[PDB]
Design a binder for this molecule. Structure first.
Ligand SMILES: NC(=O)C1=CN([C@@H]2O[C@H](COP(=O)(O)OP(=O)(O)OC[C@H]3O[C@@H](n4cnc5c(N)ncnc54)[C@H](OP(=O)(O)O)[C@@H]3O)[C@@H](O)[C@H]2O)C=CC1
Lengths: 990, 145, 96, 97, 49, 97
């Protein structure tokens, strides 16, 4: 140590510099940590975590292809009518007719005319019904070909109904209202009012209702307002003393507009709206559907951006998005000020700068969070964060919109702000800062006059009444009927949305531009005295009834059982092969032309008799179920569990005797009913397009790709012992740059690499393709019966081919391939399937593993050939001496194989042919497809908020590369004559 | 995608496809991805299942169809499954690297049987019912064992 | 808060709203909790709330009017919640 | 190039993958000389590739898909294939010769 | 320098331990600073002070 | 390719630290990603470069030569060149031999 110290002193090197710097850095860390800890003790964890940013421009999703969704919606309705799913007495027909009319153009009209005119009404009553309905709809869409789309709600108005069973079971349902069956009657009922406030072919002939839809339907409803009565919905006016009071004239304007809407529908074309707080089950969601129906351009925010929410919004646009409308979904946190500024900047920025280039006509800030059981003494971090969201950031968003319109000199296109206001401010209690936020929102009515933003923003306060449904007002649905017993009105979310959209009508917009409007939509609830006590009494009486009934029934049951002292069946999976359905000869003859009998040489007609596959979703059966229905049945779930090795079959002692499925890892029994609940999440998580799993591809991890770099040695290395043969190989490679000397006592050799020699140091690389369509995890050729020796001999692609061939013969009803030789000669069974690249794993073995001198089987070369899969098929199953022609066609390999097989049978070289395609996924091919930019970059997909399940999106505006997959597909094709003679199923004609 | 839509549209326009009768496009790689050579086989299996079920699967990742594709009036791009009252033929197209274009046409199997006599049809139907019962027995035994 | 209109509401306005609304609510809650932890139900503290007649009339005062208007929910909170034995509300509308 | 040279991080063209495909030779023939839109069916038959190609071409003309066809076979010699044929003992040992 | 390296290897003393720890600490500092900077951009300097 | 001296590589575990070698920051980070604790990378403050120091227990590859016993082949005549037939340099540099 002293010698080393002397050397360090001579070298002028400080040995404690690093520790000194480390100790300074550790002190800086504690200072910063102390600052962060003080801020968290001041703001609280809920607020500090809540202000986290969520918005980004790359995650924005646009929906504007209504020209395609119109024709989809028409075909769906047409086939629902033809199958009887929709009938003439349904309002769904009327609503879908409205939505179709809102997207009417010339191509849609030609699409309708073809499909309706080619309908054979003599095939059934449903066919005649669809013909009539379609002709009427064609007329309507011709009539509105140049009319603006309209928001028109034709849903049956429903009311609250709470029932208590004999056992004390409480059930709440929305039942159709008695005296109100249309929105026009709803407006009539609101205009009349009630004693407390005193100071059509629908459901019978949808086709007739559809014929009425284009017809713009003489006394207003404001005339029918009784004197000395406050309507349930009314507007207010401020008096010189500053208090807002009911105004007959303004309320008449509003109610007349609502009536006109209910009769003719309102348009929102050329309206640009920003709406927050509009997720599923909310009032905003119903507002957004009505805006989209009327043709508005809407940006809707979401605090839970996901694939589920994006799919919810796609479905909404594809159902309601009228022509000229657009829906933009963006991730958003209204509790973050930076998110607010960024959202408004994105909206106002030019498209060349990555923005939308819009100017807002309306702002609907309905984002909110719930505060339950937070009294005055409990107001804390969460209440502060909610008050920020619901008051301070709405003020900030208004200011941001003002600043954006002022920086551009816009003084004549004000944005209307629909403020969600509350009638109650501290009446119920235990809601944190909710009432403060809602009451503070009311200073804007005066700010509009006192400050200088009135040309950019108009204030429209809406006092939202008792709304049943979700959000915050849910949980109170069981007392809605009791509340309505006092002459008050509670509203559904559709009704409240209709009322709010009544404020976006052209006349109300002008009224807001004249001065701030206050709409009262409280349904008369303000006249009920002591609302808190009344509602508590109602709820208490309901719970009392329920509990007393339940307990009394329990006691009576016990006394009966002490004084006097069904069998249900669970389903079991029964997997079916699904051979084609054969229909009676009469019906089958009614299909093809009568002249066809005897006309065709059936030895020249090729037919598919069986098919199979091994892919990212299992067999053909499971893949079809996922493709068509999006979910597995019990048979599909059980088959996927068996394929992935979750479950196995057991028959014997388990002490009792058991026959059925058991868990493969724990050997515990499993019933078919419980298979879904046990395994479906795992099955879905490990199937289809997913993150690449290194365990399935020999440890390949796209995030750490291994390479080597050549470096010239700068100084001799330390000797290492090696065998004589290895030492001589090193000497042969390096010559003068290495020294080898036998250790006389061991017979071994020391290898000493000298300066100037070449080495290779591994280095890791991060690749940006991380997702692939992979065969389900757990898949194993042993589950199908392929033996260990074959598995260890052949390339992994050969296993997919063997399984697919066996399953395709099973799907053809041929359980023993030698049965083919009871009809044809051995020289008459061909194999014409191929691959684009073959056994790429054997290519790796011979090109890289042999280079690194790792153990590779001596016949790895043969396993790589593209015809080796067909060779193995013939050597293990078929044993034919018929034609073998292996195509290589990159991505068109399977179609080329089908063509070659058809021509092979037609030339007479074969009567049965195996056709199809196969290919695997591996590291080198993935990388090379990445270098060609043919595949999608997964990091860019993540930047746009896309998950692996949505990365393959053909024919979409944002499609940016293919997703690589693996597997095989096989079809058995033969002559129609031999297929008929053999008695095999026929799935189609090639 | 653009080239394939254009090709199918030109095919239909030249052969006089009726106006208002767009071909319904299926895109199964939205769910399975692209196997570089099994693609056509997977699409053919799906086309057979469509031909025998009458169900046309929808592209559930078709969130917004590219506006450029509206020009191809003989193509419709659904996002949801449509249960029709019958499909009679399906077109399968592939485009591999190296100028490998390919097309196959699959027709519903019930058009074959109109070319044979009633007795032959009934004999075939009985033979196929027997073969299906035996294939069911083999399939389930092989599955559990 | 001088010359802070709607578009200028920023850090300082938030800090003032905290002072003048949220921390006065917190101080009331703290006093309630202290009297409840000691079983004091018969010696309420009178809260003289400085209230304003004007709420948005002059303008350019940041969040002052929001803070003063929000202070008025207490008149109803006193009945709806359970701190009325510990605190009594006395709103004073201070004149010019 | 794609299995060893890329592993050693040596300069390899970014589209080396396409040059490896067995149908790429036919693609280049069509792209430089022929310019036809006729059938293209690339056989893979190990040492019987040329006879298989002749068979496929004859059947392609007889089916009416073509009236003129290019048929034949090709393959190269390189280090890895030589070694692997040596490990299979398919080729002659030159030292024994 | 090579003699000193030999002596350090014999003494089983890592000469770069301090620098390694210092570089880890400098990264922790930047993480904490980034959190503080986000909170100041969210709340503003007037509120935070 | 010389069948008499076929190049392979062997994996050896380092028995003692190696001498530092300078590399670019990206390359040094790739080495650190590969080796983790078994390598030390430190920026040279005056160059912006990095020193890479492979430590004991890390993995390397030393080339070793092997003698293969197949030395003869049927080769296209020496001097053959697609330029003699007219194929241009760009095509020759693009495609496989
Ligand atoms: N009866 C009633 O319902 C009454 C309602 N109101 C007011 O009218 C409005 C109507 O909304 P309603 O549907 O009833 O209430 P909800 O609570 O259902 O709506 C609030 C929605 O905002 C979204 N959200 C929550 N937090 C955030 C955040 N930090 N950033 C962005 N978005 C967020 C949520 O949806 P997602 O996560 O999907 O984005 C949530 O569903 C509310 O402001 C409410 O206070 C007033 C009086 C009565």
């Amino acid at each position: 140590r002293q010698q080393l110290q002397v050397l360090a002193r001579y070298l002028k090197m400080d040995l404690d510099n690093g520790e000194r710097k480390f100790l300074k850095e550790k002190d800086t860390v504690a200072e910063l940590q102390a600052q962060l800890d003080y801020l968290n003790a001041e703001l609280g964890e809920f607020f500090v975590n809540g202000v986290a940013t969520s918005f980004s421009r790359k995650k924005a999703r646009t929906f504007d292809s209504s020209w395609n969704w119109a024709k989809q919606s028409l075909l769906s309705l047409y086939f629902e009518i033809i199958h009887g799913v929709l009938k003439n007495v349904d309002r769904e027909v009327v609503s879908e007719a409205i939505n179709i009319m809102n997207r009417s153009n010339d191509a849609l009209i030609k699409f309708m005319e073809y499909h309706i005119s080619n309908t054979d009404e003599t095939k059934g009553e449903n066919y005649q019904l669809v013909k009539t309905l379609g002709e009427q709809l064609i007329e309507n869409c011709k009539q509105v070909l140049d009319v603006d789309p309209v928001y028109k709600d034709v849903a049956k108005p429903t009311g609250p109904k709470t029932a208590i069973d004999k056992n004390g079971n409480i059930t709440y349902s929305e039942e159709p209202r008695e005296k109100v069956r249309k929105l026009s009657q709803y407006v009539q009922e609101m205009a009349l009012g009630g004693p407390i406030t005193k100071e059509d072919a629908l459901d019978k002939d949808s086709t007739k209702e559809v014929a009425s839809l284009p017809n713009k339907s003489s006394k207003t409803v404001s005339s029918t307002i009784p004197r000395e009565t406050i309507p349930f919905l009314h507007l207010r006016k401020k008096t010189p003393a500053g208090d807002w009071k009911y105004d007959r004239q303004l309320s008449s304007l509003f109610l007349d507009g609502l009536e006109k809407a209910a009769f003719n529908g309102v348009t929102f074309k050329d309206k640009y709206v920003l709406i927050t707080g509009a997720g599923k089950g909310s009032i905003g969601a119903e507002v957004l559907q009505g805006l989209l129906q009327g043709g508005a351009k809407v940006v809707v925010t979401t605090s839970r951006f996901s694939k589920q929410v994006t799919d919810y919004y796609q479905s909404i646009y594809a159902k309601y998005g009228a022509k000229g409308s657009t829906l933009i979904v963006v991730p958003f946190n209204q509790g973050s000020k930076q998110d607010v500024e960024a959202l408004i900047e994105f909206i106002y920025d030019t498209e060349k700068n990555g923005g939308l280039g819009w100017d807002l006509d309306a702002i609907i800030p309905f984002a909110a969070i719930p505060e339950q059981g937070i009294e005055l003494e409990h107001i804390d971090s969460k209440s502060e964060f909610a008050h920020r969201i619901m008051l301070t950031n709405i003020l900030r968003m208004m200011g941001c919109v003002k600043k954006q319109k002022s920086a551009r000199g816009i003084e004549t296109r004000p944005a209307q702000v629909i403020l969600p206001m509350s009638p109650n401010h501290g009446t119920f209690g235990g809601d944190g800062m909710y009432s403060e936020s809602k009451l503070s929102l009311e200073t804007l009515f005066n700010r509009w006059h006192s400050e200088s933003w009135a040309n950019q923003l108009t204030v429209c306060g809406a006092i939202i009444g008792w709304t049943r449904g979700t959000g915050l007002m849910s949980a109170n649905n069981i007392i809605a009927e009791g509340i309505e017993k006092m002459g008050v009105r509670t509203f559904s979310q559709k009704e409240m949305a209709f009322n709010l959209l009544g404020l976006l009508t052209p006349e109300v917009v002008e009224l807001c531009q004249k001065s701030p409007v206050m709409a009262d939509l409280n349904g008369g609830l303000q006249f009920v005295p002591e609302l808190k006590e009344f509602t508590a009494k109602l709820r208490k009486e309901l719970v009392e009834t329920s509990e007393v009934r339940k307990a009394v029934s329990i006691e009576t049951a016990l006394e009966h059982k002490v004084v006097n002292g069904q069998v249900e069946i669970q389903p079991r999976a029964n997997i079916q092969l699904d051979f084609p359905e054969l229909k009676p000869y009469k019906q089958v003859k009614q299909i093809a032309p009568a002249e066809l009998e005897g006309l065709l040489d059936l030895e020249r007609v090729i037919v598919v008799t069986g098919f199979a596959e091994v892919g990212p979703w299992g067999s053909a059966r499971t893949r079809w179920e996922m493709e068509a229905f999006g979910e597995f049945s019990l048979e599909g779930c059980v088959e996927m569990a068996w394929i992935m090795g979750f479950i196995s079959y057991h028959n014997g002692n388990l002490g009792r005797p058991y026959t059925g499925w058991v868990d493969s890892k724990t050997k515990e029994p499993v019933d078919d009913k419980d298979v879904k609940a046990k395994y479906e999440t795992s099955i879905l998580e490990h199937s289809g397009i997913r993150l690449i799993e290194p365990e399935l591809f020999n440890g390949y991890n796209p995030e750490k790709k291994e390479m080597i770099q050549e470096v010239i040695v700068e100084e001799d290395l330390e000797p290492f012992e090696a065998s004589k043969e290895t030492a001589e190989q090193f000497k042969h490679q390096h010559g003068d740059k290495v020294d080898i000397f036998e250790i006389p006592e061991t017979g071994e050799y020391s290898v000493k690499l000298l300066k100037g020699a070449t080495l290779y140091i591994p280095k890791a690389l991060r690749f940006d393709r991380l997702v692939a369509g992979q065969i389900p995890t757990g898949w194993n050729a042993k589950t199908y019966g392929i033996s260990d020796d074959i598995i260890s001999q052949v390339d992994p692609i050969t296993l997919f081919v063997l399984v697919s061939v066996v399953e395709a013969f099973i799907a053809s009803g041929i359980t023993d391939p030698y049965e083919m030789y009871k009809y044809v000669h051995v020289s008459e069974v061909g194999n014409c399937s191929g691959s684009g690249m073959g056994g790429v794993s054997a290519l790796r073995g011979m090109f890289k593993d042999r280079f690194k001198d790792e153990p590779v089987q001596n016949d790895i070369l043969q396993e790589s050939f593209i015809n080796t899969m067909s060779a193995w098929v013939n050597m293990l199953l078929i044993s034919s001496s018929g034609p073998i022609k292996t195509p290589v066609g990159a991505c068109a390999t399977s179609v080329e194989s089908v063509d070659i097989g058809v021509e092979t049978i037609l030339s007479g070289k074969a009567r049965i042919c195996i056709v199809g395609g196969y290919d695997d996924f591996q590291e080198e091919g993935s990388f090379e497809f990445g270098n060609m930019k043919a595949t999608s970059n997964t990091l860019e997909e993540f930047e746009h908020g896309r998950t692996p399940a949505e990365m393959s999106r053909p024919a979409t505006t944002t499609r940016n590369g293919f997703m690589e997959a693996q597997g095989a597909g096989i079809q058995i094709i033969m002559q129609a004559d031999l297929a008929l003679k053999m008695g095999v199923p026929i799935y189609g004609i090639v | 995608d653009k080239n394939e839509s254009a090709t199918i549209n030109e095919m239909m326009k030249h052969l006089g496809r009726s106006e208002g009768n767009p071909v319904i496009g299926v895109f199964q790689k939205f769910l399975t991805g692209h196997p570089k050579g099994a693609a056509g086989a997977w699409m053919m299996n799906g086309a057979l299942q469509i031909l025998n079920s009458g169900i046309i699967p929808g592209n559930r990742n078709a969130d917004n169809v590219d506006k450029i594709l509206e020009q191809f009036e003989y193509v419709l791009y659904p996002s949801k499954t449509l249960k029709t009252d019958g499909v009679r033929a399906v077109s399968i197209t592939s485009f591999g690297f190296g100028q490998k274009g390919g097309q196959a046409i699959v027709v519903h199997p019930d058009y074959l049987y109109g070319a044979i006599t009633e007795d032959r049809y009934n004999e075939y139907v009985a033979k196929v019912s027997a073969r299906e019962k035996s294939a069911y027995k083999f399939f389930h035994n092989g599955m559990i064992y």
